[PDB]
Design an enzyme around this catalytic site. Structure first.
Site, PDB file in Angstrom:
ATOM      1  N   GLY A 103       0.767  -1.227   0.000  1.00 59.75           N
ATOM      2  CA  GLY A 103       0.000   0.000   0.000  1.00 59.75           C
ATOM      3  C   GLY A 103       0.801   1.281   0.000  1.00 59.75           C
ATOM      4  O   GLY A 103       1.954   1.316   0.425  1.00 59.75           O
ATOM      5  N   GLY A 109       0.834   5.403   1.092  1.00 60.64           N
ATOM      6  CA  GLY A 109       0.308   6.417   1.985  1.00 60.64           C
ATOM      7  C   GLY A 109       1.092   7.684   1.726  1.00 60.64           C
ATOM      8  O   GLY A 109       2.203   7.620   1.201  1.00 60.64           O
ATOM      9  N   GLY A 110       0.537   8.835   2.081  1.00 57.31           N
ATOM     10  CA  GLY A 110       1.249  10.070   1.828  1.00 57.31           C
ATOM     11  C   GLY A 110       2.565  10.022   2.571  1.00 57.31           C
ATOM     12  O   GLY A 110       3.604  10.384   2.024  1.00 57.31           O
ATOM     13  N   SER A 111       2.526   9.561   3.815  1.00 55.08           N
ATOM     14  CA  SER A 111       3.738   9.429   4.610  1.00 55.08           C
ATOM     15  C   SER A 111       4.117   7.957   4.765  1.00 55.08           C
ATOM     16  O   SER A 111       5.277   7.576   4.617  1.00 55.08           O
ATOM     17  CB  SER A 111       3.556  10.079   5.982  1.00 55.08           C
ATOM     18  N   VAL A 126       3.582   0.316   3.097  1.00 54.54           N
ATOM     19  CA  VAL A 126       3.449  -1.033   3.682  1.00 54.54           C
ATOM     20  C   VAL A 126       4.112  -2.017   2.698  1.00 54.54           C
ATOM     21  O   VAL A 126       3.745  -2.060   1.521  1.00 54.54           O
ATOM     22  CB  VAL A 126       1.995  -1.476   4.045  1.00 54.54           C
ATOM     23  CG1 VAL A 126       1.986  -2.849   4.727  1.00 54.54           C
ATOM     24  CG2 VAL A 126       1.307  -0.456   4.941  1.00 54.54           C
ATOM     25  N   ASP A 150     -13.330   6.513  12.473  1.00 54.19           N
ATOM     26  CA  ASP A 150     -13.063   6.532  11.038  1.00 54.19           C
ATOM     27  C   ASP A 150     -13.196   5.150  10.425  1.00 54.19           C
ATOM     28  O   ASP A 150     -12.556   4.847   9.421  1.00 54.19           O
ATOM     29  CB  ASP A 150     -11.677   7.106  10.747  1.00 54.19           C
ATOM     30  CG  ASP A 150     -11.476   7.425   9.278  1.00 54.19           C
ATOM     31  OD1 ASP A 150     -12.469   7.768   8.603  1.00 54.19           O
ATOM     32  OD2 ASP A 150     -10.327   7.336   8.798  1.00 54.19           O
TER      33      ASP A 150
HETATM   34  C1  5NW Z   1      -0.558  -9.645   0.443  1.00 55.51           C
HETATM   35  O1  5NW Z   1      -0.982  -8.842   1.544  1.00 55.51           O
HETATM   36  C2  5NW Z   1      -1.952  -7.901   1.325  1.00 55.51           C
HETATM   37  C3  5NW Z   1      -2.564  -7.661   0.107  1.00 55.51           C
HETATM   38  C4  5NW Z   1      -3.543  -6.679   0.003  1.00 55.51           C
HETATM   39  C5  5NW Z   1      -4.233  -6.468  -1.297  1.00 55.51           C
HETATM   40  C6  5NW Z   1      -4.509  -7.468  -2.290  1.00 55.51           C
HETATM   41  N1  5NW Z   1      -5.156  -6.933  -3.311  1.00 55.51           N
HETATM   42  N2  5NW Z   1      -5.300  -5.600  -2.990  1.00 55.51           N
HETATM   43  C7  5NW Z   1      -5.978  -4.692  -3.907  1.00 55.51           C
HETATM   44  C8  5NW Z   1      -4.758  -5.306  -1.802  1.00 55.51           C
HETATM   45  C9  5NW Z   1      -3.885  -5.935   1.126  1.00 55.51           C
HETATM   46  C10 5NW Z   1      -3.277  -6.172   2.342  1.00 55.51           C
HETATM   47  C11 5NW Z   1      -2.308  -7.164   2.455  1.00 55.51           C
HETATM   48  N3  5NW Z   1      -1.694  -7.462   3.666  1.00 55.51           N
HETATM   49  C12 5NW Z   1      -1.442  -6.610   4.688  1.00 55.51           C
HETATM   50  N4  5NW Z   1      -0.840  -7.131   5.767  1.00 55.51           N
HETATM   51  C13 5NW Z   1      -0.614  -6.271   6.734  1.00 55.51           C
HETATM   52  C14 5NW Z   1      -0.958  -4.902   6.689  1.00 55.51           C
HETATM   53  C15 5NW Z   1      -0.713  -3.988   7.739  1.00 55.51           C
HETATM   54  C16 5NW Z   1      -1.087  -2.690   7.596  1.00 55.51           C
HETATM   55  N5  5NW Z   1      -1.684  -2.201   6.500  1.00 55.51           N
HETATM   56  C17 5NW Z   1      -1.933  -3.029   5.483  1.00 55.51           C
HETATM   57  N6  5NW Z   1      -2.534  -2.553   4.349  1.00 55.51           N
HETATM   58  C18 5NW Z   1      -2.920  -1.153   4.219  1.00 55.51           C
HETATM   59  C19 5NW Z   1      -4.149  -0.998   3.299  1.00 55.51           C
HETATM   60  C20 5NW Z   1      -3.913  -1.764   2.003  1.00 55.51           C
HETATM   61  C21 5NW Z   1      -5.384  -1.558   3.995  1.00 55.51           C
HETATM   62  C22 5NW Z   1      -4.376   0.475   2.980  1.00 55.51           C
HETATM   63  C23 5NW Z   1      -1.588  -4.443   5.508  1.00 55.51           C
HETATM   64  N7  5NW Z   1      -1.859  -5.268   4.460  1.00 55.51           N
END
Ligand code: 5NW
Ligand code: 5NW
Lengths: 258, 258
Positions: free
Chosen positions: A17, A19-21, A24, A132
């Site tokens: 992912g 983010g502005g700051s 991940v 939120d």
């Molecule tokens: C393979 O893993 C992943 C794949 C996808 C995915 C698959 N397809 N798309 C479109 C997205 C999403 C999330 C994850 N996994 C994952 N694990 C820990 C996290 C800890 C903190 N923030 C996260 N994501 C921030 C977000 C995406 C929600 C803004 C985290 N995402």
């Protein structure tokens, strides 16, 4: 590419992912165990901003022991320039999963609902109100939903809506645990009818008026799950005093009876 | 695929945009001249909803003669089931263009600003306040911006944000031509600093508080165009009474002096 956190070396597999700051990364340990590393660049942050991140990390660490519905934080590195958080890696976030999936199984929806309630209830106990909530705050980790963040600090998008906003947040322009109940109610309404309650409206000024409008009436089309329809009507009450609470939602037949 | 509008046959080249009810197709006439056909399915619309569409079409037809900054409506077909609008086809919408373009030329920004003011001023004269202005309401047709819709009816996305919302719209939970000035000001602020004034904020409740907060102060970093910076500060005044008007913006050195 590679990175170091508390002495341990992690090799970046890919960026999840943006983010502005924040960023991940899906990473691998020397052992070759998978993790998610959240990186926050602090080089342009103010004292108030820094405190929110510090608070959010402190609550994430503390709530580890309280519930398994909260994402695992294994380690972290905090300096004046950046923050590195070593977390468990999930399959996908709930927002991306809901966009990909047309129809959702009733047992999947019930299981996800229960997990969401347990995670949000845990934070409420420690005096935290997210405020939120949206599907993007939930991570699917082996058929289990885990709450990613506490609303104390900033959010991201994968590599902003007013659809989940409670009426009391708008009317006060107040926020209590009941505000989180409304937002959870919108997530469940989406998993049920395939759309949020006010999703159809286009004009944002008009959408905000509808949410706080007593006269505007949400539509609850008849479904085979009568308990599910009652939960939706209970979560989406405009008066927070009359809105159902989480401890009550945990005692509801929808969550308890199969 | 093909379609008929007022006897004339049009062959669909591709779909440009998707709307919950509306659809926009790039089509070709027998002559092989290009057009954009907007299709609205009315099979689930209420009387109030129907009236808005009728009103919007009536103003689109009437404003044709008043300004060339308004999209050309050539013909239309209205029944109980659907609406077909034969319009000129543009290159791309302003939102898609701004996402693709990192840096924008100062003369391009000034030319686009002037066009936006002329289009919005024309609607104001006929007593119409859009109230939902954003880059997606503007179409680039041969280096000229043309306003696509009047905010009287619904909107679409190609194949929803609170970033352009004026403070008076939130405080009243009032809307006058000055509300459109704030939204235009946010579009110009984006074309100048690469971001909207409150774009950085993540929490939507917090973003709404900031917009109506007198204490929160918008940042206007020093730029070579001193006239441009003054326009931005004038459009983004929180009190609509103290906010600059369109007839004044048309007399500003930024628009008049090269
Ligand atoms: C393979 O893993 C992943 C794949 C996808 C995915 C698959 N397809 N798309 C479109 C997205 C999403 C999330 C994850 N996994 C994952 N694990 C820990 C996290 C800890 C903190 N923030 C996260 N994501 C921030 C977000 C995406 C929600 C803004 C985290 N995402
Ligand atoms: C080739 O033509 C186009 C391409 C693109 C384009 C290129 N790339 N991307 C991402 C988008 C956008 C717009 C047009 N043209 C066009 N002409 C007339 C219209 C009349 C009414 N509504 C329209 N669009 C509705 C929207 C997209 C703003 C929600 C119209 N669009």
């Amino acid at each position: 590419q590679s990175m170091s956190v508390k002495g341990r070396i992690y090799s970046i597999l890919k960026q999840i992912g943006s983010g502005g700051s924040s960023k991940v990364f899906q990473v691998l340990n020397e052992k070759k165990q998978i993790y998610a590393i959240k990186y926050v660049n602090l080089e342009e942050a103010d004292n108030q901003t820094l405190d929110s991140y510090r608070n959010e990390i402190a609550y994430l660490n503390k709530l580890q022991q309280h519930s398994d519905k909260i994402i695992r934080l294994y380690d972290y590195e905090i300096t004046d320039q950046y923050i590195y958080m070593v977390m468990e890696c999930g399959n996908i976030d709930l927002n991306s999963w809901l966009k990909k999936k047309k129809s959702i199984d009733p047992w999947e929806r019930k299981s996800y609902w229960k997990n969401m309630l347990e995670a949000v209830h845990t934070i409420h106990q420690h005096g935290i109100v997210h405020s939120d909530l949206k599907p993007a705050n939930f991570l699917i980790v082996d058929g289990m939903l885990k709450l990613i963040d506490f609303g104390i600090a900033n959010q991201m998008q994968p590599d902003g809506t007013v659809n989940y906003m409670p009426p009391e947040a708008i009317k006060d322009m107040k926020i209590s645990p009941k505000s989180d109940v409304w937002s959870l109610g919108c997530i469940l309404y989406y998993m049920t009818y395939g759309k949020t309650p006010f999703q159809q409206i286009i004009n944002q000024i008009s959408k905000l008026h509808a949410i706080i409008d007593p006269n505007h009436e949400i539509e609850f089309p008849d479904i085979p799950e009568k308990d599910l329809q009652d939960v939706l009507k209970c979560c989406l009450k405009r008066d927070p005093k009359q809105r159902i609470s989480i401890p009550e939602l945990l005692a509801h037949p929808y969550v308890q009876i199969q």
